[PDB]
Design a protein around this ligand. Structure first.
Ligand SMILES: CCCCCCCCCCCCCCCC(=O)OC[C@H](COP(=O)(O)O)OC(=O)CCCCCCCCCCCCCCC
Ligand SMILES: CCCCCCCCCCCCCCCC(=O)OC[C@H](COP(=O)(O)O)OC(=O)CCCCCCCCCCCCCCC
Ligand SMILES: CCCCCCCCCCCCCCCC(=O)OC[C@H](COP(=O)(O)O)OC(=O)CCCCCCCCCCCCCCC
Ligand SMILES: CCCCCCCCCCCCCCCC(=O)OC[C@H](COP(=O)(O)O)OC(=O)CCCCCCCCCCCCCCC
Ligand SMILES: CCCCCCCCCCCCCCCC(=O)OC[C@H](COP(=O)(O)O)OC(=O)CCCCCCCCCCCCCCC
Ligand SMILES: CCCCCCCCCCCCCCCC(=O)OC[C@H](COP(=O)(O)O)OC(=O)CCCCCCCCCCCCCCC
Lengths: 177, 258, 149, 145, 147, 258, 146, 146, 177
């Protein structure tokens, strides 16, 4: 998730171990070693003691990512990962979410309002609108779909199928009468 | 529109209707659903700490104050009747059959009935409560079941501690500051207690709206919509209702037994 | 349609809560395990000033029951008290008397019975014949030292 | 039929305004009162303990309540007035009402002794004769010399 | 950790102790009040002021509590059965057991009058002789109004 | 570290120290700072609505229940003394000099002492409370001054309404369900009231910890750090403290006058 | 808007009405029991249990309440000043004001007798004679010492 | 802001500990731990209302409490044990001590007449002569019935 | 501000009027006309009745912008304007914040973690870090400042002056010992 979704109760280490301590029965040392190698992979290896309350909001997400990649899942979801952080943290995160795919060969489903970086890294982007997929494609075909709805979305072009103004009555009468 | 105003009123009717319906379903799922993988008892310990222990200094000091107030009121209420020394059978009967558990509710439902709702509300709002499912643990058994258990097995103990400190403070002001005689106090007290009939009465009274408090005080936290305004309103709904229900069930439970 | 299910269960629970009215749920004078069968009796007194309902009728000190009601029989303008007796107590002859006592000094004026002796015992729903009315602090003082000096 | 369920609100309104009228039925027109049974007067020389709206009894059974007490300065006496149930109307007029005290400290209360004069209470006649309430000070000041 | 286990256990125990102190040092059921004590019966002619949970005493100090008052359906007297502390096992059998009112208006306890014998007790038997409890209507119907 | 543990303890000491210091400064700035441009009285009306009126159904129902409980307890407490009819001078003296305002605090400080903190907390957290300055209005006079005024002029009225409904319910159960006599009740009641000496006592008692409740219940909301967890913890601090202070000042205010 | 003002005003009036109902009815204040009463004094040798606002009565029925109590610095007696309803205005001068206690533990109120057939009063005057307040000590030690 | 912080913490902990101590001195009541004064015994024939912590007194003013009451298995009598404020140390052995009852309903309490004039005490010794408490029953018995 | 910072108490219209009703004494009609023309300029002219509680989180910001541009201030600040919204709303907002400057000639100070759109529209960007301005420039000079701190910030380049890993002890010992 975005905002990490860490358990405020448990410290970082136990937090990352949790999925293991659930789906697998490993010698409490071996769990520690898997947690450690994962935390190193994500970089938050040092703060193996901090409680997430103590943890700076940036890394508070990378630890969540490490918790995810625990158990080595074959696919994984991202709920608005790169939303609202300094481009250094956004950069490290967009490097990790891609490193996990280029190395571990695991399907990843980013879900982001941010068009730029999404279309940058993604391979087959969709567009979901009002209960119906509003088409889909690789970034290229999507950049020139010419479907008014979509081409309005994937570009700035504020006025189009989605209206700019609210459904007012009249800019003349209301202001005059 | 008046007709649509009444429409909204009735919609709120059905709303509280389905609300407590869903609440009892929630309670069932929580206490008797399954046994989860990542559960245990250490959870119950941590909770019971956060709910009972932290909320213990409040009820200790509050028992102290309410006890000495009960005394300073009984002494002066009754000196006009001569039966001054009987203050013990007051400060220990009112503080033990009705006012004891009622104030213990309004305080427990005040603090641990709220900072318990805000807790599992915040959990739901940062999605932390949801990733539990994507992991696989049932939250209704890992997150809220220890809440309910820290409720049922703390508030009665808290009521007992409150009643004890209240009686002791009442004595300490009556003996040392009012000057009434030492042994006479405990004497008239023990001569007018009816243990199985007042003390146990107060304890069952405490337990029943312990259950009722920490039932809503956790349901509301589980249901509140995830936004910093939603939780800020749920942790008020769960004081409105947690006091309403405290007093209402006190009334019923004292009509069951005078 | 989970909404329907929730509404149904909530109605069940509101029913369960309304099943706790406590305005004459279990109408009795005691619990449901105790039979509460207590046979009637009447008594003819001349003053029952402190024999209010919910008193304690006794015999040799131990309670035998409670008064049920007090009445002024409009014919003789005396007091008629109707009270109850536990059935295990079924052995009171008719020549026995009843009289109001006083618990200690300022205890509520309960009524005791003094067993007389007679083979026939009780219809237990009958009345009494003889008694001694409750002492009053007025006629006592009046006849001893208010007007007899 | 979600609009067709607006009725719930109706119910609640009909459930609320109902309770109000029931909270306002403190009089409770389900008659259990006595319909203002009949007044009687009496004159005493001292009614010290007799408080307003105490209890009037006979043969120990409560007859009713004293409605009020007053003083006539011409006679300097206490004129008390009490209601008496109508079912008990066979009181004779000579029957005297005197102040008694329950037990030894129970509150003062007027008890009547029937006179059997065959003239049933005229229902309104002031009491002809009585015995006033005793007074501790009266007792002690009568016998200290 | 464990600093939480110790705290929570401490205060669980605190609540439990408080429940007991309510039950025992505030209601006084049985911690040596009606435990290791032995019975006796007594026949009284009137137990008007005698109630359950009363007090049996001797020379003023308490010897124990009373347990059950009953009516013997034959003689209609009171059979009062009570517990006695086991340390006190030195009473003669001819000794009486009267009913005394606490102070001047207190409740009615019963006190023992040592008679003096060799046979001491059965602690579950009854008593032979005693003096009943007074009552105002008696004393005033007694030698005060018979002229 | 134990030495550093005590360091943290002492830091919390200085923390509550400076806390209530800053609190009294805040209160001064709020009630006597200046007169702002965009203020008025309609603000006070809207607030007084949101704080008093909405929190009125709770205390009405609560007065009802606590009154009939006070009765059903007094009737049975006192029938063992014969002076049954004196229940009026109980259910109307305890519910009017001590328990009345105390419960009215624990309820007002429960609901309107919290959904008042969460309100101006949320305001601070969505920066809404800050853009007021960038506009130019002093928030401490536009946002919180009407809160304080809706506090001081609501909780006493609420205590009065509570005491009234409590007495009336006590009568209604005593008269209609206990059967005690109609006129005797109000008679013994009015014979044992001492208006300027009990009623006014209870009212000044209500006012003082009305001030004290809606003082912290708004300060905490002004000070809480802006995050959905911060507010969720402040709206619990302002129930802990708002009950602590209710009972503490009740005790002091009843030692000033028995 | 307007519904806010109406609601808040209605319920402010409700609050103030409740305050009065606590003041007027339940607390039994002046308006319900206000009246025109005049003063009188009385010299007693002893008033042991005469409390402020204790009742003063005649023929048993209450008349007024004691207003105040003082010790006269000359003869060290109890000067008690008390009120009487105006409609009670026929008490002659030789009436006697004694201290009476209804129940043996009842409070020590005052009761006044009928003073023959002389002029009534100034109702602002004093009274001349009395029967002072008895005590347990004097009661018993009087019937002792020899 | 690094020294006075720890100093304040220690001040606060000390204050809480002191409040603790002051609170605990209520139980094990505030007249010392053992008084810290002298014990004494006494024998009676009836101590009906002299339950634990009853007032021992001389000339009215209380001297201390009673500590314990027991039924001596030998004489079948009552034995009562009580402490004495140490400033009170001039009580001759030949004193008597009967169970007074303040007023009529008062809780019985033992009052000590100085008795004779002899050796003061050992303050841990026993007493010899006394008058047991009275009982209403004996009184309306022996002196009324026969 | 971001998140609009509207007054939940007052409806949209009164909300936008507030600054006028504060700093100026205008006939209550004339205030309505200024509010209306502004709301039209921002597009939220229709919802002149909604309460912000009723208002969809997107326009909940454009109304705030209209409230700002009320009184016609000569400079105005933006606290993270384009953070977390669909690129249509982001597009209309980035069109408005630029229209206000190109037309009304009013200084505007965007403050955004988002580097891309900021550097797109901005003219003289700064970089604030740990209490000291970490340089400044027009986008161009800033794109190749070669100052390690800055060049790490304005580009992805996750590892540099700002460390990637946390200050751990040893990836060998800790995992081994
Ligand atoms: C025919 C059956 C179909 C539906 C019937 C459902 C009606 C029963 C539920 C009543 C609740 C209606 C309140 C709605 C008003 C509102 O705005 O809602 C008020 C609040 C919620 O308000 P908001 O949603 O606006 O915040 O709800 C509540 O107050 C819930 C507490 C009500 C009590 C629940 C248990 C009832 C106790 C027994 C009743 C006592 C009566 C005494 C009779 C002897
Ligand atoms: C919050 C304030 C606390 C309340 C105190 C206010 C005044 C006290 C109550 C007024 C009643 C006393 C007047 C009668 C005079 C008299 O003769 O009263 C004194 C008499 C004298 O008989 P005794 O000497 O045997 O005690 O005794 C009694 O009446 C026994 C009752 C004592 C109280 C015991 C506790 C039961 C009360 C109810 C408990 C729960 C209610 C509290 C919350 C609702
Ligand atoms: C004089 C007659 C008195 C009338 C009596 C009627 C009132 C009875 C007491 C009132 C109860 C308070 C209602 C609160 C619920 C509410 O507001 O309902 C509202 C809320 C939710 O509503 P919203 O989410 O819409 O706000 O309800 C809940 O939070 C769900 C759970 C409700 C708790 C019910 C408690 C039932 C008590 C059962 C006791 C038996 C258990 C014992 C087993 C050992
Ligand atoms: C018999 C059927 C009746 C069932 C119960 C009816 C519930 C009706 C609730 C509506 C009450 C006013 C709500 C106004 C909305 C508002 O502004 O305020 C609603 C408030 C909270 O305000 P918010 O909307 O801001 O959340 O919610 C409440 O707290 C309402 C509490 C209702 C409690 C009902 C309990 C029943 C009463 C028992 C009395 C017993 C007497 C019987 C003696 C014989
Ligand atoms: C006629 C008399 C006039 C009385 C005048 C009223 C004065 C009221 C002053 C009270 C201060 C209120 C605090 C304001 C809220 C706040 O900001 O204070 C909040 C801060 C906490 O700040 P943070 O938690 O945010 O750090 O401090 C508090 O929590 C205060 C706690 C209040 C507890 C009250 C206890 C009083 C009783 C003590 C008596 C001891 C008895 C011992 C005898 C054995
Ligand atoms: C002349 C003597 C008078 C002294 C006056 C002082 C009395 C008032 C003390 C205020 C009460 C503090 C409770 C506040 C709630 C709280 O702390 O909130 C509970 C907090 C919560 O902790 P978190 O920071 O983890 O959330 O716990 C604490 O850290 C506080 C621990 C100790 C606080 C004191 C409580 C016990 C001491 C009470 C003293 C009573 C004396 C007895 C009289 C004989």
């Amino acid at each position: 998730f975005q905002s990490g979704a860490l358990f405020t109760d448990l410290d970082v280490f136990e937090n990352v171990a949790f999925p293991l301590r659930v789906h697998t029965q490993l010698p409490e040392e071996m769990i520690r070693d898997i947690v450690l190698m994962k935390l190193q992979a994500v970089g938050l290896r040092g703060a193996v003691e901090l409680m997430p309350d103590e943890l700076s909001g940036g890394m508070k997400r990378r630890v969540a990512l490490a918790r995810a990649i625990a158990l080595d899942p074959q696919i994984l979801l991202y709920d608005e990962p790169f939303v609202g952080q300094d481009p250094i943290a956004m950069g490290v995160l967009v490097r990790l979410i891609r490193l996990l795919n280029d190395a571990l060969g695991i399907t990843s489903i980013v879900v982001s309002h941010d068009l730029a970086e999404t279309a940058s890294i993604a391979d087959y982007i969709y567009i979901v609108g009002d209960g119906r997929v509003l088409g889909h494609g690789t970034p290229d075909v999507l950049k020139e779909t010419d479907d008014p709805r979509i081409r309005q979305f994937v570009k700035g072009i504020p006025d189009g199928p989605v209206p700019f103004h609210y459904p007012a009555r009249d800019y003349r009468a209301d202001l005059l009468g | 529109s008046p007709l649509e105003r009444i429409r909204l009123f009735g919609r709120a009717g059905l709303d509280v209707v389905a609300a407590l319906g869903r609440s009892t379903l929630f309670l069932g799922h929580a206490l008797l659903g399954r046994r989860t993988p990542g559960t245990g008892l250490h959870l119950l310990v941590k909770q019971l700490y956060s709910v009972g222990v932290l909320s213990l200094a409040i009820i200790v000091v509050s028992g102290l104050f309410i006890g000495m107030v009960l005394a300073l009121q009984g002494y002066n209420i009754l000196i006009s009747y001569g039966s001054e020394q009987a203050v013990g059978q007051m400060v220990a009967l009112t503080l033990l059959r009705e006012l004891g558990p009622v104030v213990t509710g309004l305080l427990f439902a005040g603090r641990a009935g709220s900072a318990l709702t805000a807790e599992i509300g915040n959990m739901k709002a940062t999605e932390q409560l949801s990733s539990l499912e994507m992991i696989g643990v049932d939250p209704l058994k890992y997150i809220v079941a220890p809440r309910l258990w820290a409720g049922f097995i703390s508030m009665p103990l808290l009521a007992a501690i409150f009643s004890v400190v209240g009686i002791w403070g009442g004595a300490m002001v009556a003996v040392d500051w009012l000057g009434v005689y030492e042994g006479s106090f405990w004497a008239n007290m023990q001569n007018s207690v009816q243990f199985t009939e007042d003390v146990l009465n107060g304890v069952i009274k405490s337990i029943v709206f312990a259950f009722v408090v920490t039932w809503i005080a956790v349901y509301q936290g589980y249901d509140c919509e995830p936004t910093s305004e939603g939780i800020s309103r749920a942790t008020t709904r769960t004081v409105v209702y947690a006091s309403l229900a405290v007093l209402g069930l006190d009334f019923i439970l004292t009509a069951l037994m005078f | 349609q989970t909404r329907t299910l929730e509404i149904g269960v909530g109605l069940f629970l509101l029913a369960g809560l309304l099943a706790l009215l406590l305005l004459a749920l279990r109408v009795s004078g005691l619990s449901v395990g105790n039979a509460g069968d207590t046979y009637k009796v009447y008594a003819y007194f001349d003053n029952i000033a402190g024999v209010t309902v919910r008193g304690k009728v006794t015999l040799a000190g131990v309670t035998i029951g409670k008064v049920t009601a007090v009445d002024l029989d409009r014919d003789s303008y005396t007091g008629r008290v109707t009270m109850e007796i536990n059935q295990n107590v079924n052995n009171l002859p008719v020549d026995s008397t009843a009289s109001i006592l006083t618990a200690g000094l300022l205890g509520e004026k309960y009524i005791g019975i003094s067993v007389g002796g007679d083979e026939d015992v009780l219809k237990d729903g009958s009345t009494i014949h003889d008694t001694q009315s409750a002492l009053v602090l007025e006629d006592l003082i009046g006849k001893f030292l208010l007007n007899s000096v």
